[PDB]
Write a protein that holds these residues in place. Structure first.
Motif, PDB file in Angstrom:
ATOM      1  N   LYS A  67      96.578  46.818  -0.890  1.00  0.00           N
ATOM      2  CA  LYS A  67      95.230  46.968  -0.406  1.00  0.00           C
ATOM      3  C   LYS A  67      94.318  45.699  -0.651  1.00  0.00           C
ATOM      4  CE  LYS A  67      91.908  50.081  -2.024  1.00  0.00           C
ATOM      5  NZ  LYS A  67      90.530  50.236  -1.444  1.00  0.00           N
ATOM      6  N   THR A  68      94.684  44.821  -1.594  1.00  0.00           N
ATOM      7  CA  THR A  68      94.019  43.518  -1.713  1.00  0.00           C
ATOM      8  C   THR A  68      94.764  42.481  -0.885  1.00  0.00           C
ATOM      9  OG1 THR A  68      93.174  44.033  -3.907  1.00  0.00           O
ATOM     10  CG2 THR A  68      93.049  41.756  -3.316  1.00  0.00           C
ATOM     11  N   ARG A  69      94.057  41.822   0.020  1.00  0.00           N
ATOM     12  CA  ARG A  69      94.687  40.695   0.713  1.00  0.00           C
ATOM     13  C   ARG A  69      94.079  39.420   0.153  1.00  0.00           C
ATOM     14  NH1 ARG A  69      97.511  43.527   5.183  1.00  0.00           N
ATOM     15  NH2 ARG A  69      97.950  45.487   4.095  1.00  0.00           N
ATOM     16  N   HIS A  70      94.920  38.491  -0.323  1.00  0.00           N
ATOM     17  CA  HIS A  70      94.474  37.240  -0.905  1.00  0.00           C
ATOM     18  C   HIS A  70      94.484  36.203   0.165  1.00  0.00           C
ATOM     19  CE1 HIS A  70      95.601  39.278  -4.760  1.00  0.00           C
ATOM     20  NE2 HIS A  70      94.539  38.605  -5.170  1.00  0.00           N
ATOM     21  N   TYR A 125      85.516  35.562  -4.484  1.00  0.00           N
ATOM     22  CA  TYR A 125      84.737  36.561  -3.768  1.00  0.00           C
ATOM     23  C   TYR A 125      85.680  37.773  -3.526  1.00  0.00           C
ATOM     24  CZ  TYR A 125      87.171  34.118   0.135  1.00  0.00           C
ATOM     25  OH  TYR A 125      88.091  33.517   0.943  1.00  0.00           O
ATOM     26  N   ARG A 126      85.132  38.917  -3.143  1.00  0.00           N
ATOM     27  CA  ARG A 126      85.992  40.108  -2.927  1.00  0.00           C
ATOM     28  C   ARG A 126      85.212  40.943  -1.960  1.00  0.00           C
ATOM     29  NH1 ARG A 126      90.039  43.303  -5.561  1.00  0.00           N
ATOM     30  NH2 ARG A 126      89.490  45.550  -5.501  1.00  0.00           N
ATOM     31  N   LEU A 127      85.619  40.840  -0.698  1.00  0.00           N
ATOM     32  CA  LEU A 127      84.863  41.463   0.357  1.00  0.00           C
ATOM     33  C   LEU A 127      85.476  42.811   0.701  1.00  0.00           C
ATOM     34  CD1 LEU A 127      84.792  38.344   2.711  1.00  0.00           C
ATOM     35  CD2 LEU A 127      83.050  38.818   0.951  1.00  0.00           C
ATOM     36  N   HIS A 169      90.149  45.052   0.313  1.00  0.00           N
ATOM     37  CA  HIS A 169      89.313  43.967  -0.244  1.00  0.00           C
ATOM     38  C   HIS A 169      89.955  42.592   0.072  1.00  0.00           C
ATOM     39  CE1 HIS A 169      87.682  47.455  -2.497  1.00  0.00           C
ATOM     40  NE2 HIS A 169      86.549  46.763  -2.458  1.00  0.00           N
ATOM     41  N   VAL A 170      89.169  41.657   0.599  1.00  0.00           N
ATOM     42  CA  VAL A 170      89.731  40.364   0.825  1.00  0.00           C
ATOM     43  C   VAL A 170      89.322  39.451  -0.314  1.00  0.00           C
ATOM     44  CG1 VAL A 170      89.734  38.416   2.335  1.00  0.00           C
ATOM     45  CG2 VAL A 170      89.749  40.776   3.272  1.00  0.00           C
TER      46      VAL A 170
END
Ligand code: ZN
Length: 125
Positions: free
Chosen positions: A107-110, A57-59, A4-5
């Motif tokens: 797994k989350t990239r900010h 947002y969270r793509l 998730h970005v």
């Protein structure tokens, strides 16, 4: 692989400036787009989404990618819809790292925040 970005969108209320500061307001409903060229020199993987109440947002991304970046596309505030070009002449995008080739486990990239810009200067700008 799934990712998730995550990033933020604001309204910069200082038309004279190009930045996010304490006067900046989180924007709900903004539309952003992730585009990755994946070293093919044209965009070949793209994903769109909208920010939420906190302007976040969270793509959801499938697979690893290269040459990825996030751009603003649409504002939900007609009073705050400029996309400020940088002094270099280029539009600012937020880069993201979705490379397989690192020791990063999250797994989350900010990503860095983006802003649309008002037409006026608020008091204290
Ligand atoms: Zn590349």
């Amino acid at each position: 692989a799934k990712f998730h970005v995550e990033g933020e969108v604001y309204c910069n209320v200082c038309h004279s400036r190009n930045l996010i500061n304490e006067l900046s307001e989180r924007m709900a409903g903004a539309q952003v787009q992730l585009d990755c060229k994946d070293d093919s020199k044209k965009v070949i993987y793209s994903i769109g989404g909208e920010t939420d109440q906190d302007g976040v947002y969270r793509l959801p991304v499938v697979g690893y990618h290269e040459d990825c970046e996030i751009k603003l596309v649409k504002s939900s505030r007609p009073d705050c819809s400029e996309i400020p070009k940088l002094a270099k002449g280029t539009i600012q995008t937020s880069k993201v790292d979705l490379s397989k080739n690192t020791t990063i486990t999250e797994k989350t990239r900010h990503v860095k925040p983006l802003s649309f810009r008002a037409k006026t200067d608020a008091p204290g700008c």
